C-alpha cells in the first residue's frame with residue numbers, strides 16, 4: 001500500500017525523500033522550496049526544466 | 055528522429071547541436087547549465103574539431119536566436135569503450151557561457167533515487183534531435199521530438215543482439231515506426247514531471263532505426279549523476 005513518496009510523490013513538486021516516517025520535499029538547483037515545504041519556486045530567469053515562453 | 059513532431063517554439067530549449075568544420079550537425083547534446091553540455095562519448099570521435107550550436111530549430115534559416123559556442127574542455131568518461139558503447143557519456147565545458155533566452159535553457163539534473171523510482175517508472179520520456187528521419191534517410195533540417203515508452207529491461211535484453219549494460223536503458227516501440235536515429239546520438243532524453251523536464255538519458259545507439267523487435271538504447275543518466283556533478287566541479 002502506497003504511502004509517503006509513493007503516494008502521489010508525497011505532494012512534492014519535484015524531489016521526494018522519506019525520512020523517518022515522513023515525506024521531505026526538495027528541488028533542483030535554481031529553485032527554492034516554498035514556505036509550504038512542497039512547491040518549488042524558480043529563483044531566477046530561465047530556470048532548468050521549463051520550456052521557454054519568451 | 056523517425057516519426058514524432060517538430061519542436062515548436064520554446065519546446066526543446068535544452069537541445070544542443072554538435073557541428074563539424076563544415077557547419078553541419080553530426081551529434082546532439084543537452085544543455086546542463088550556462089557552461090556545460092551533456093553528450094555521448096562516442097560522439098567525440100565523429101569529428102576532429104567541433105563547436106556547439108544552441109537555439110536552433112531550423113538549420114536552413116537564421117531565425118536570430120542561434121549561437122555557436124566553442125568547446126574549451128572535453129571530459130570523456132574514462133571507462134568509455136567503443137566495442138559495447140558502455141559508459142557512453144561526456145560533458146563539455148564551453149569557453150563562453152550560454153545566454154538563456156527563448157529556445158535556449160537547461161534541462162534539470164534529477165537526484166538519483168527519486169529519478170529512478172519516479173521518473174524512470176513513468177510511462178514515457180522524450181527524445182529529440184536533428185538526426186535522420188528514417189534509417190536510410192538524410193538528417194533533418196528541423197528539430198524534432200518524440201515521446202518514447204520506457205521499455206522493460208528484460209524485453210530489451212531479449213530484443214538485443216548486443217549486451218545491454220546497467221549503464222544503459224531502452225526506450226521506444228517494438229514495431230511502431232518511431233525512434234531516434236543516426237545523428238540524434240548524444241542528444242537529450244528527458245522525462246517530464248509536473249511540467250518540469252529532467253534529463254534521464256543520452257541518445258546512444260540502436261540497431262538501425264525503428265526496426266521491428268528493436269529499441270533505442272540510451273545512456274542511463276542516473277548511473278552518472280555523481281560523475282556529472284564532479285565534471286561540472
Ligand SMILES: CN1CCc2nc(C(=O)N[C@@H]3C[C@@H](C(=O)N(C)C)CC[C@@H]3NC(=O)c3cc4cc(Cl)ccc4[nH]3)sc2C1
Nearest residue numbers: 137138139216234235236257258259260261262263270271
Ligand atoms: C554494441 N554496439 C554499440 C554501437 C552500435 N551501433 C549500431 C548501429 O547499428 N548503428 C547504426 C549503423 C552505424 C554504421 O553506419 N556502421 C557501419 C556500423 C552508424 C550509426 C547507426 N546508428 C543509428 O542508426 C542509431 C543510433 C540510435 C540511437 C537510438 Cl536511442 C535509437 C536508434 C538509433 N539508431 S549497432 C551497435 C551495437
Ligand SMILES: [Ca+2]
Nearest residue numbers: 112113115117
Ligand atoms: Ca536556424
Ligand SMILES: [Ca+2]
Nearest residue numbers: 227228265268
Ligand atoms: Ca522497434
